[PDB]
């Protein structure tokens, strides 16, 4: 019978200290009020500019598995009870964002009120959303501003981007003249964004928009698109995460995300940790942002009622 | 007879745009009120924690050559009329900083009033100091806070440092357990400073203080020295400078600093430009911070009454 106490002893090891985990990573303040069958609205994680109709398909401790109504279960995904890119039924209508209805339906005709009755289902209550009354820190970022952004789907490339929306303390990065498939949400301290002129001065090759870098001028482009660059003072410095090699923690199995496993910090860089699942081969290691809501301190699973997968026997 | 107009034409070249130069680099707002013989107080540029008695030895356009009273002329140095690390007679006494008197004198016995009469000289008036009433931007930096700083004298090395003083919007970086010879003044956006934990996560080797990195803990050290780390949010992002290769500008000859020469941006990095003096061999090129008060737009010398050395014949 395995426990963290004796495991730390035998292994002569140490946990990543609790104080290094941020609010969404650490022990939650409250219970998981979500119930299977509850419906809500959510950003499609692979199409981050798109809002979708979602149902809680499963609940596990402080986490929920969400399902795209009327679509295949292969798209299902797990987030914690306090996730940021989920909203209550009605939020899209309230804020004027476009809501993708379930499969078979027309966007115009969809009507939550009738849909909830048909499905004999309740919407998750508004109290559950940790994002209903977020304290808005002042920011230099505004919709329309341009900048230089890593393509998260191809992180080798830095590209011309624009802020196309803002919600609470987050904003949506969109790559000019590309499909919205590559959009992503981040904040002002993101290590994946830089002011215009960054690439040139760091000897990196800026990917310019399709239909247009050996000539490209930011100035000409800003002028022709009647746009402003995000001011440099708007960007913030990402605090060092302080995670060290060999420290222990609990982390979601990216590949079988129903599980959380005992893990070790194998490696570290300026904004990522390389996680190793104890007892597994090293080819199951992987890199994840050190601020990720899917890594947690020792004890998280216990305190929140989620099973911890012990080290592979 | 050489002029910038015809030189730009013949060379088929372009000036660095005026708008890229910062306030201390660009055309000044007022004349140079300094006069030879005027006395003042100044930071010793090679010992930046030390204040010294200085005399204006020469005036050229908007610049002044300053002399350390009673010491060798080899120490003389040039700054612009609006320099930051010069202060009026009496400033050290006003602010409680230690003033190094001229050679031969005792620090305690030195007395500006009697010294000015003996030398039959006037102190530069307080109006001349662009630093007398500087608008103080709010900052997270406070005296005592620790951080990681490049050694500017050996910029290969990042080392453990502390903020040991603050004046207007600048602060003094001091390397723990080293001589003060390595101190230097900077601001919150300096590319030479980073929060604690930076080095470890960027695969750099932090130089720890003498008398103490394969074991070093920032936490233990902060605790034992009863000190706080400068918060990450206090650091700011250095705006890209926008200087491009082949662009023309005017710049001080670092090696014979009485002269300002026609120059070309030869190379660029994240915070520096490599200047080339037109007509000279490439072995006279050198690197300088792109925010340096010694590089200026085409026309600076004309408008301020400083001679421009044309391209070497
Ligand atoms: Co569709
Ligand atoms: Co577009
Ligand atoms: Co797709
Ligand atoms: Co990254
Ligand atoms: Co970094
Ligand atoms: Co002395
Ligand atoms: Co010291
Ligand atoms: Co010395
Ligand atoms: Co440097
Ligand atoms: Co940089």
Describe the structure in your own words.
The structure is a homodimer of 313-residue chains. Chain A has 313 residues and is mostly beta strands. Chain A has 3 domains: 1-30 and 241-313, SH3 type barrels (Roll); 31-134, Roll (SH3 type barrels); 135-240, SH3 type barrels (Roll), CATH 2.30.30. Helix content of chain A is 12%, strand content 29%. The first copy, chain A, is built from 6 helices and 18 strands. The first copy, chain A, has helices at 4-11, 91-95, 112-118, 198-201, 218-224, 300-304; strands at 39-44, 47-60, 63-68, 77-80, 86-87, 99-100, 146-150, 158-167, 170-175, 184-186, 193-194, 206-207, 248-252, 260-268, 272-277, 286-289, 295-296, 308-309. In chain A, strands 1, 2, 3, 4, 5 and 6 form a 6-stranded mixed beta sheet that branches. In chain A, strands 7, 8, 9, 10, 11 and 12 form a 6-stranded mixed beta sheet that branches. The radius of gyration of chain A is 21 Å and the shape is globular. Chain A binds chain B through residues 195-198, 200-203, 231-233, 235-242, 244, 268-271, and chain B through 195-198, 200-203, 231-233, 235-242, 244, 268-271. One cobalt (II) ion binds next to loops of chain B. Chains A, B: It is found in: Nucleus. Chains A, B: MBT repeats lie at residues 2-102, 110-209, 216-311.
């Amino acid at each position: 019978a395995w426990c963290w106490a004796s495991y730390l002893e035998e292994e002569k090891a140490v946990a990543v200290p609790a104080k290094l985990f941020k609010e969404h990573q650490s022990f939650p303040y409250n219970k998981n009020g979500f119930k299977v069958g509850m419906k809500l609205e959510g950003v499609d994680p692979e199409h981050q500019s798109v809002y979708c109709v979602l149902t809680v398909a499963e609940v596990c401790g402080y986490r929920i598995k969400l399902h795209f109504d009327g679509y295949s279960d292969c798209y299902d995904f797990w987030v914690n009870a306090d996730a940021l890119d989920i909203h209550p039924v009605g939020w899209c209508e309230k804020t004027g964002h476009k809501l993708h209805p379930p499969k078979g339906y027309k966007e115009e005709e969809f009507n939550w009120q009738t849909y909830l009755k048909t499905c004999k289902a309740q919407a998750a209550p508004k109290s559950l959303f940790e994002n209903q009354n977020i304290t808005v820190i002042p920011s230099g970022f505004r919709v329309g501003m341009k900048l230089e952004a890593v393509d998260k789907k191809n992180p080798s490339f830095i590209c011309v981007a624009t802020v196309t929306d803002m919600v609470d303390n987050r904003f949506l990065v969109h790559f000019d003249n590309w499909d919205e498939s590559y959009d992503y949400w981040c904040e002002a301290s993101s290590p994946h964004i830089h002011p215009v002129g960054w690439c040139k001065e760091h000897r990196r090759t800026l990917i310019t928009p399709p239909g247009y870098v050996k000539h490209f001028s930011w100035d000409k482009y800003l002028e022709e698109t009647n746009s402003l660059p995000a001011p440099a003072r708007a960007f913030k410095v990402k605090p060092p995460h302080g995670f060290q090699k060999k420290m222990k923690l609990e982390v979601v199995d990216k590949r079988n995300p129903m599980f959380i496993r005992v893990a070790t910090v194998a490696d570290t860089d300026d904004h990522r940790v390389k996680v190793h699942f104890d007892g597994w081969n090293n080819c199951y290691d992987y890199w994840i942002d050190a601020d990720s809501p899917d890594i947690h301190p020792v004890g998280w699973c216990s305190k929140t009622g989620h099973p911890l997968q012990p080290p592979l026997s």
